[PDB]
Symmetry: D2
Subunit: 564 residues, 4 copies
């Protein structure tokens, strides 16, 4: 059992969620910590505390209510919170994170109770260092930061966006073993364009429009300097839920000098590629053999596309051959050389070709082996698309990644029905198992970002990686796919079970760490004997620490009170 | 505004519900307190904070949910909690106290989240003083203590009875202006005879049967020494929800030596007598002239009967004559001289008479002018009973005090219908107004303990009364009756409106204070010239204290830094 | 200024020597820190504070009393302490360190007032980690540890030796700008061989003889692990005043794994070599042209000679031929091949020659160009030896490094007299300037270890050097030599003035930093543009930090308290 | 003896002259109060 020898005592100790064990404090602990009397006279194991929380949890009426209970728990007893979450990760993850946290964010100003994380405003420009001083933990190793401009698929929720870093970091700990005491959730509030928040008497954020331009850019620059300067260059800074243009610009500006990544961009690319690589073990061919069409050409599309191209390069295909294997379709139709409304990013995939608008005709023309939906238009993979995909391919790869299911390009039911059970399918949001007329039940998995960010963070931090390369994400994808068993693939699953996520994370971290020592990118020395054991030692446990003073005697001769 | 300069700073300040203002902290406060950045960047007035709480309160679906919300509030921001409560005292009183606190106590072990008050067990015997040391407020002026043996009419709830002192003290503050920082809810856990709880894995108390006899009595003795020793002999100790024999025994043992009362006995007495004194203004006769019949002969009845006797003595009637004006019925029937099953206390009212069992007959024989239900038998005041009462009395006084409504001896509807609108009626649980055939609308009042205890406590503590005499409760009954206007009486109310409870408490306190300095019973000197203003100055306000340091300049010459 | 935002307030703030300004706190600072009233009502500039201290210092009767006064200052107001020291380092250095600290250590148990530093005993074996936890500063970058077995020339002073690490770390700050808050003095008490201490009722250490052997070695291993584990592998650990065999064994065992050095061995080497390199600018010839005779063969001689050999090798000489340039004399006389009583270390200088035991004849035989005294035998450089050195050499280099004065191999007076003014002289202890017969005055300097260790520590920590090589000491010696002007060399000074010592340290650290980036040994990234400005930014100023909260407004619109 | 239960621990406890016993703090007091290591390893009676 770990130590932690606190100087805190009495009432204020019970107010620190990292020290407070509530009823799991033993009589000895209570008396020694000067809190005996502040708790009822029973001693609970952690399991009994978990039963109590779960009894409450079940009598609630909704997931939002269940979220409120769990956030209350987080703010009173951090270890019990994590014990609860880890006790059934697949059940608790969608409560503290997506999709429920979506509603939590929409509702954040109304239900606002106890604050979590640090709020830094445009009006703190020049003072970010001193805002950091307000945070009561000095040793921070991981920051998740948002500006609330692009929350999930809900858009600009300004300061209400604070629900995202808080819940995301809960998953860093629960799924990846990051120390919660070492994690800092951050919102930068530069204003909001959210009309309802601007009108709303209860809104907790700055009641102003967003600050744009170089004032915004300088602010972010100060943010990066203040945080790395205070917590050291090794501190991970993860961007979440910024607007695309911002997310891309900020990632490119900083990635080469700070320990930073953007999960919406790079993590998405990673888990999508993991799924593709897993699928390859069913189609029994190479990435090189694929023709990939993206339904959508936005942040997810370009991120995934980028990473696929490197995977192709890694197979031994030159960049320009690599690129020609990938077609995009945006809201105006296929991306072709010299089409109107193209961006610099879309341009990279604008091959010479007739312009087309109709996705059915696009499918018939391109004949992809892999069709990836990241456009947020529900039902875009029509019956005709699915028949055509199953006609051109023995085992068509079909990813409906748009969330929630009401947005999915197709359902698993339609996908398997129309492709006569031949499709290799993955989704963004959970679909139930599907049983074919031959009595086999297929279990389509989700390309959940959680498979990526926890392990990456743990890896990067454990070995002191100063930079987070594209290769980190490609490597990570290979590790995930590797955890998928032949048995899983045969059941139609392209991702390891969600209930294993702790282990998947461990393996991702193991690999990054192993790699870092081998290519001398690690900064933590001396090099560990055993890389598995070392990563494990860096992982937060849900068991309570001991916090009692270390008490031990000396030989009586030298322990005696001298007199004369 | 009150100035209270805190030395607390940073995170831990926000964790103290006496310091924490939430979003009502100004920018200046936040920066000065080293918490700037721990809150979202909006600044709320107290009225805006209330609105947030009320919106959430109105989204909830049960009184229990409402109770849990307000209790979470109490533990985060005490001032805002009291601001919410006092915003609509009549609405909020039944949520934080009775009847809702009844369910809270049944569910206490299940919903246990953030502890409140001080738990002292039989096993801390000989160490009570060191248990007290855990309480983070040194200055304590009021204590409510239970052993949980008799929580409401719910029986032995042992350690689950902590809901009662906590909720009771909330009303001390809300209704009487007692400073919550100076209030200490206590449970003594000596075990429980509650069998579900002894079996309940979640039970927060000592999983054992109650300690009885002299070990119990000695423990209580230590409690009174430790408490009076630490907080001084002026600290008010109120007993609540003890079993019958204990309640009387403890009250009798200590009331002469400590500043102590029992509210189930003496407060009930005071509020019942107040309703009688008010009724007398309708029946236009003396207390002398009354014949009182109690349905029930427990804590309530015996307390009420004692104070009526004391009132009769005041008017000038000898004690043995006063006693003969009062008859009691227990579960065994009428209390008469030389009946089987008589406690020492019931003996005092056993007059020579034929034994009787049936309440209808008893009423027909005794022909009371006033009939008081304190037996918790619902519907005991049958049509025949009421008919009888209206037959022998021009204006029969009828108190149906049993709680809740289901246990009331009759409804207001029944009582008025069957007595042809003639009865003077009061109850323990609220009934809607009744409009009679003659176009009169009557508004039957509730004999709420809340009219009494907050004012008594405020008064006693304000002037430093060392003992709480019978006289205090009688004068209190008088003060309460005085706040009833003839308009009220003509409307059939025997109590002031509930929404004026703060004003009632002040008048009660004013009276106690004036009396104590008159009869030199006060211990707080020098005597204030203006007792009204002095009491008011002792009342807690729901406005935020200023906690920032006192900043002010000195003349230039003496403020300057000395160099050369 | 520099900003250090504390959460401490009220009395306890004044008790923290890093926060306390005493009378230099402004009225604003006082009111804001909740300490207004705890100080008399005058506001002093730091200079006024210094004037008060120095007046007190000048009225005292002994250097011992002055030491106690300054040590009392250190423990009340750290910044003022350092301000005082640095106002006249030549004056104050000999009070807080040698020779006064020698007497302090002899008297430590008698005068023990307020503790300084951390005490770790053999009896804490297995629990050193938890002893570290008592230290109130979490961020430690420099540790000075002794076991007290060889304090100065006063032998084994056991626990009383704690005065050495305290006084040494004062010089690290005063002379080199190490942050004292980041410094940790440590005594390891494994017992003492000092019989008078063992007998003394007041002795503050373990009343037992020294644990030897594997138990000792394992204890030291845990210490290294515990300290490097808590404070990190970049934390500088400097050994001081261990017995010889221990000092060497420990240094060799750890120098390749930990960021460690031993100042008695390696710092002595560096400063002595610096003096030699400076002398070469008078003799105007090369190091390889010298013949060096050591009076003594102890820790100092072996260490100095080792570094001379390296400097010769650098100039271009193979090792075996450089060794030939150095002759050692011990208590059994000259070291020569096959001789009785030879340690393996002496063996390295055991050349082919006949045994001799008379220093005078040894001189006459060897005809050294350089005579280095480190044998502690007062007066060993006799008039005859001084005549011989003057006869064989135009400018004989003569170092009487033995400490204090009474142990010097010769005085400045005698050296200059008998060598008729041509000796190039330096000592370990200060001698007054010497007026020669021709009325010119020479100013022999001191080979004071303070020229070396402050700058080495500053440099190593600034760039995060993980190991401290012999080259560091050689380079450092060169840098110090470079700081000596020609004019100084003509005044008989081999060392830069003590009053520039901060500047010397800065130069030394600049050089270490410049080299560490050049040769890819630095661990602090990114690489700074200006090494000079970088090092200087890391140096602790004696100017008071600002500790008030950072207060600043927001535009009126967003700072406004919101209502309805 | 009289008992005064302090919530103060570690370095700052030693800076309170009503709490601080110097070398009269026993090894157990020192370890309990999180000050073990801040004093030399001998225990003094008041005399
Ligand atoms: N791990 C997962 O499960 C993840 C799933 N996703 C899902 O992917 C979807 C897209 O996300 P993201 O890339 O961030 O969103 P963006 O807004 O960046 O991308 C939207 C893209 O869809 C395009 N589009 C809109 N209508 C059509 C249409 N009718 N036909 C073709 N393309 C169309 C837009 O076109 P234009 O460029 O012309 O506007 C744009 O290219 C979301 O539903 C998100 O939930 C995202 C990340 C992770
Ligand atoms: N201000 C208010 O609203 C207050 C209301 N009350 C109400 O009064 C009621 C009694 O409270 P309390 O006095 O504390 O309770 P106790 O339990 O102390 O007394 C109950 C009495 O009722 C008697 N009783 C039981 N059954 C019958 C029966 N069938 N016929 C006649 N008498 C019977 C019991 O008889 P025995 O002695 O034989 O057991 C006992 O004397 C409760 O319902 C309570 O809510 C109380 C205080 C204040
Ligand atoms: N910067 C400075 O000014 C420094 C000065 N010094 C000074 O140098 C002196 C030596 O210190 P250190 O080397 O640590 O001490 P040690 O005790 O390690 O070495 C002393 C040496 O003197 C030898 N010796 C003893 N008697 C004689 C003799 N009659 N003739 C010749 N040699 C003799 C001893 O011989 P054996 O091996 O036979 O015992 C031993 O070699 C001390 O006075 C110290 O103050 C030291 C470090 C730094
Ligand atoms: Mn996101
Ligand atoms: Mn009660
Ligand atoms: Mn030394």
């Amino acid at each position: 059992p770990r130590r932690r020898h606190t100087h805190q005592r009495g009432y204020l100790l019970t107010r620190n969620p990292h020290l407070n064990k509530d009823l799991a404090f033993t009589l000895e602990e209570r008396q020694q910590l000067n809190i005996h009397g502040l708790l009822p006279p029973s001693f609970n194991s952690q399991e009994i505390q978990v039963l109590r929380v779960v009894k409450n949890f079940e009598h609630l009426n909704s997931d939002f209510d269940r979220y409120l209970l769990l956030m209350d728990l987080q703010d009173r007893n951090e270890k019990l919170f994590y014990r609860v979450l880890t006790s059934d990760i697949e059940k608790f993850m969608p409560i503290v994170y997506t999709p429920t946290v979506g509603l939590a964010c929409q509702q954040y100003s109304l239900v606002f109770r106890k604050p979590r994380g640090l709020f830094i405003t445009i009006h703190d420009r020049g003072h970010i260092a001193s805002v950091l001083n307000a945070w009561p933990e000095d040793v921070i190793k991981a920051i998740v930061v948002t500006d609330g401009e692009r929350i999930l698929g809900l858009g600009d929720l300004g300061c209400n966006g604070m629900g995202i870093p808080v819940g995301k970091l809960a998953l860093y700990t629960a799924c990846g073993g990051m120390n919660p005491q070492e994690c800092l959730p951050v919102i930068l509030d530069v204003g909001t364009e959210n009309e309802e928040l601007l009108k709303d008497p209860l809104y907790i954020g700055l009641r102003q429009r967003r600050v744009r331009g170089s004032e915004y850019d300088d602010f972010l620059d100060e943010f990066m300097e203040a945080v790395s300067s205070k917590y050291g260059m090794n501190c991970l800074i993860q961007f979440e839920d910024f607007a695309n243009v911002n997310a891309f610009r900020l990632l490119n500006k900083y990635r080469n000098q700070y320990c930073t990544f953007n999960d919406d961009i790079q993590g998405t690319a990673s888990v999508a590629v993991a799924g593709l690589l897993a699928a390859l073990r069913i189609t029994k061919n190479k990435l090189s053999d694929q023709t990939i069409l993206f339904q959508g050409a936005g942040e997810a599309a370009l991120g995934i596309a980028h990473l696929i191209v490197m995977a192709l390069e890694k197979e031994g295909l030159p960049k320009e051959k690599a690129i020609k294997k990938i077609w995009l379709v945006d809201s105006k139709g296929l991306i072709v050389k010299g089409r109107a409304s193209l961006t610099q990013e879309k341009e990279k995939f604008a091959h010479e070709h007739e312009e087309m608008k109709n996705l059915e005709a696009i499918v018939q023309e391109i004949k992809p082996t892999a069709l990836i939906g990241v456009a947020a238009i529900g039902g875009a993979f029509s019956e005709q698309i699915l028949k055509d995909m199953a006609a051109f391919n023995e085992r068509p790869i079909i990813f409906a990644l748009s969330n929630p299911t009401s947005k999915a390009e197709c359902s698993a039911e339609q996908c398997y029905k129309i492709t006569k059970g031949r499709a290799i399918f993955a989704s963004g949001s959970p679909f139930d198992p599907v049983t074919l007329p031959n009595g086999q039940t297929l279990y389509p998995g989700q390309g959940n970002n959680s498979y990526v960010f926890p392990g990456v963070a743990l890896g990067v931090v454990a070995c002191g990686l100063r930079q987070i390369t594209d290769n980190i994400f490609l490597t990570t994808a290979e590790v995930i796919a590797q955890q998928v068993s032949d048995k899983h693939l045969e059941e139609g699953r392209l991702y390891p079970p969600l209930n294993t996520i702790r282990d998947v994370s461990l393996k991702i971290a193991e690999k990054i760490v192993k790699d870092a020592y081998q290519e001398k990118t690690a900064t933590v020395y001396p090099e560990p004997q055993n890389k598995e054991a070392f990563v494990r030692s860096q992982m937060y446990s849900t068991d309570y620490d001991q916090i009692l003073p270390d008490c031990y005697s000396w030989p009586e001769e030298v322990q005696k009170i001298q007199t004369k």
